[PDB]
């Protein structure tokens, strides 16, 4: 019901109090800005979600290198630091059953199965498309997902609440990093529970939405 | 039946063997040896590392030097510890000047003495070592995956100083790290599967 | 025991792709990956992609991007091959490989097809 | 791609001679080599695998060893069978790519 409102552009979405913030603590300036040119939340494309969906990935800010006015700056300055506020949105009637866990995973190295390859570039960066969970229950990293609560995280539950916003500050060992070469968070979407209902299949889509919040520039050229 | 340890400090510091090598000396008529010194060769060190994304803290190197026998009686071998840090090139032309260029420091100790044990302080471009790197090595467009070129601490070089020994002994070295000083951030979940190769986290199941 | 059986020719004009069949046996087929191999006339070793058994996870190269797919079936414990659009540009010997846990070797080949298009 | 780059790119030997090729690679790919030999009539046949490690069923005389900067693939007696076409491969990290290969010739 409640309108979230940044910049030129705005969606509807639930009422928003109690947000989660990664660690406690909130994407501050580094002790121009863009809180203009670059603001509004970036729509992601709408992913269709059927009971054998395992699961899928953002990296960050994989699936921003080019999107609307951000992608300009990407590969036109030298630097940057950037926090993100993510709201995820699952719209689906009464009827409907399941479970989604968003969960952001910090410094998320990628593997393979049954071999010792290391996976290549357009392996790891997928761009905007994102790619698809492997075997989700190892997470790919060879983890477990059920001690992988231990990061910030939000349940999506189709009884109490079909959204989430997570906000994402500057986790790096840097005080800035590279555009097109290092990852600083990820966002997955975990699918615990499957799809299920009185037909044999049905399409449960998901909006994606992230918001590069107090950032900043540094190294112009071009 | 029926917090003061439960601290990171605590935990993550503990004395383990990250090195273990014997090279054979019997006659020559070379001996060295130069590691990285990381933690993810020693499985259960690395494990125990994993648990966290970034971490601060000096690393403590300690040499322990035994000698076993291939009765003639042990001498008293005078060995040099040389640590290498990152930046410097390495054109060996053994036998001739780089060991003892004083740049690099060294540390010189004998069989029987208590085992030498110096801190190496933190070295890094960036706040802290980073166990978790998602990105490629550098900027090559294509450069390797899953190691930071931001973060190497530097190869360890041990040789002995005397020449040649006319003896059939065998000298083992270990090399026991304790790290101090540890700062934790960004806890994550273990790894139940086992590694399958020490240079990234491909897993087999 | 343990072979790999790719055989044929089959060429074929532009306007349709031919797709290649690799069947395994003397091996659990599941729980090993395929590989692919392209020998050009050229003396060409160019790689084309590799596929996991157990899920469809593929892996392409930058210049065969978007032309070469890869799917396999684990009922029949075979490999396939599917390109699109080949021009008179294309000619080689496809190859089909395995790989494993360790080393995720080439020990075994195929006997290899002729491909020769013409206009 | 990481290429690898295979030279000498062709040789003239006769029976004996050892002879090793040196392939050097622009990244580290740590000890996971490979080597595979290609018969004239379309077959290809791996011989030296991990430096050190070697086939079973393959005779001894297929050897390797590295200087930390190359790889190198040594033979310690060449035959009549032995002209071949010799690449080394890079399985440590996607993509795979393949070496430039030589061609061995006999002195006439």
């Known amino acids: 019901v409640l309108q979230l409102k940044l910049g030129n552009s705005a969606i509807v979405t639930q009422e928003a109090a109690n947000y989660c913030c990664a660690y406690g603590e909130w994407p501050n300036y580094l002790p121009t800005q863009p809180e203009t040119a670059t603001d509004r939340f970036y729509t992601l494309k709408s992913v269709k979600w059927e009971t054998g969906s395992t699961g899928w990935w953002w990296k960050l800010p994989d699936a921003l290198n080019n999107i609307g006015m951000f992608g300009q700056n990407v590969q036109h300055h030298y630097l940057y630091r950037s926090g993100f506020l993510i709201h995820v949105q699952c719209n689906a009637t009464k009827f409907h059953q399941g479970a989604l866990l968003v969960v952001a995973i910090p410094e998320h190295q990628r593997g393979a199965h049954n071999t010792n390859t290391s996976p290549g570039f357009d392996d790891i960066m997928k761009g905007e498309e994102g790619g698809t969970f492997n075997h989700p229950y190892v997470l790919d990293d060879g983890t477990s997902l059920a001690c992988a609560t231990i990061f910030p995280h939000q349940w999506i539950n189709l009884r109490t609440n079909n959204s989430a916003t997570i906000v994402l500050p500057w986790m790096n060992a840097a005080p800035m990093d590279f555009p097109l070469r290092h990852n600083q968070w990820t966002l997955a979407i975990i699918p615990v529970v499957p799809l299920g209902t009185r037909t044999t299949s049905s399409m449960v889509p998901i909006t994606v939405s992230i918001a590069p919040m107090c950032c900043e520039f540094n190294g112009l050229r071009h | 039946t029926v917090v003061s340890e439960t601290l990171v400090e605590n935990f993550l510091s503990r004395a383990a063997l990250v090195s273990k090598r014997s090279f054979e000396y019997k006659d020559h008529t070379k001996n060295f040896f130069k590691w990285t010194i990381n933690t993810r060769s020693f499985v259960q060190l690395r494990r125990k590392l994993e648990l966290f994304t970034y971490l601060r803290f000096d690393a403590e190197i300690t040499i322990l030097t035994t000698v076993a026998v291939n009765y003639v009686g042990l001498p008293d071998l005078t060995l040099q510890a040389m640590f290498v840090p990152t930046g410097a090139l390495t054109p060996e032309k053994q036998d001739s000047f780089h060991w003892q260029s004083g740049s690099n420091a060294s540390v010189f100790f004998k069989i029987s003495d208590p085992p030498a044990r110096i801190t190496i302080p933190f070295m890094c471009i960036n706040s802290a070592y980073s166990v978790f790197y998602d990105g490629f090595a550098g900027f090559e467009k294509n450069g390797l995956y899953g190691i930071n070129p931001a973060d190497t601490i530097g190869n360890l070089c041990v040789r002995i100083v005397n020449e040649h020994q006319p003896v059939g002994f065998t000298v083992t070295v270990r090399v026991y790290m304790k790290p101090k000083h540890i700062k934790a951030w960004a806890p994550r979940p273990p790894r139940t599967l086992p590694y399958m190769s020490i240079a990234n986290a491909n897993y087999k199941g | 025991q343990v072979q790999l059986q790719q055989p044929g020719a089959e060429l074929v004009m532009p306007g349709a792709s031919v797709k290649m069949s690799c069947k395994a046996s003397g091996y659990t087929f599941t729980d090993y990956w395929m590989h692919w191999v392209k020998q050009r006339p050229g003396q060409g070793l160019e790689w084309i992609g590799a596929i996991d058994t157990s899920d469809s996870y593929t892996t392409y190269n930058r210049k065969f991007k978007g032309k070469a797919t890869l799917t396999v079936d684990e009922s029949s414990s075979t490999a396939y091959m599917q390109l699109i659009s080949l021009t008179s540009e294309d000619s080689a010997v496809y190859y089909c490989?395995?790989?494993?846990?360790?080393?995720?070797?080439?020990?075994?080949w195929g006997q290899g097809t002729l491909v020769t298009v013409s206009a | 791609d990481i290429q690898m780059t295979q030279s000498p790119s062709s040789l003239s030997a006769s029976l004996g001679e050892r002879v090793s090729l040196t392939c050097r690679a622009s990244?580290?790919?740590?000890?996971?080599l490979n080597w595979l030999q290609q018969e004239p009539d379309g077959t290809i046949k791996r011989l030296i695998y991990?430096?050190?490690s070697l086939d079973s069923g393959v005779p001894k005389r297929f050897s390797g060893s590295r200087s930390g900067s190359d790889y190198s693939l040594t033979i310690s007696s060449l035959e009549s069978e032995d002209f071949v076409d010799y690449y080394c491969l890079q399985y440590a990290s996607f993509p795979l790519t393949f070496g430039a290969g030589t061609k061995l010739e006999l002195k006439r």
């Open positions: 991990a430096t050190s």
């Open positions: 490989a395995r790989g494993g846990g360790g080393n995720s070797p080439f020990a075994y």
């Open positions: 990244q580290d790919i740590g000890s996971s």
